[PDB]
Amino acid sequence: REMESFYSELKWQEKNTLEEIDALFKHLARIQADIACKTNTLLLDTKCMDTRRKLTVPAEKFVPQVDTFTRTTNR
């Protein structure tokens, strides 16, 4: 909940500044970076919340289905 609320208000403020358009551009920079980090946080959080069902759901049904996007490269 609380992360989502923070994210939404951040986007609205950024948008208003956008239609308003030096320090302004600087603040655009800070807001943009903040949005990036917030997205990373929420995605990791959903990833973690996925695996909880393993302790409760009947065995045959469990399959994660969030992020089977295998990212590791070198091998």
Binding site: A29, R71, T72, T73, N74
Partner: protein, 118 residues
């Protein structure tokens, strides 16, 4: 002979855990250092942005380096998570054998009473 073999097994497994944590510490420190330098890299690309052709080509090369550094970081944490899971398994198994077996083995009988008060 059973006793001796069992002891040797346990000792070897303990040594394995030793090696594992020895690795983990400096692994984490390296991770932190990589993150520091990457943050410095974002700051540096903004610094390079400041004075605004050759410049353009340089900026593109720098951003490519951003990408591969981030890739290295992610591989790092994958290795890390593997290491902790295996740590957990190994420690649990060592508890298992270092508690059940020898404690029940102390109950072993004695030669004279196997001879039946001979």
């Amino acid at each position: 002979a059973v006793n001796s073999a069992f002891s040797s097994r346990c000792q070897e497994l303990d040594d394995s855990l030793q090696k594992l944590q020895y690795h983990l510490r400096k692994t984490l420190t390296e991770i932190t250092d990589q993150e520091h330098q990457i943050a410095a890299l974002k700051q540096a690309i903004k610094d390079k942005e400041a004075p605004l052709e050759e410049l353009n080509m340089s900026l593109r090369a720098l951003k490519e380096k951003l990408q591969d550094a981030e890739q290295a970081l992610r591989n790092l944490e994958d290795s890390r998570m593997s290491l902790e899971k295996d740590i957990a398994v190994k420690t649990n198994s060592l508890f298992i054998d270092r508690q059940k077996c020898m404690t029940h083995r102390n109950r072993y009988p004695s030669v004279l009473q196997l001879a039946g008060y001979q």
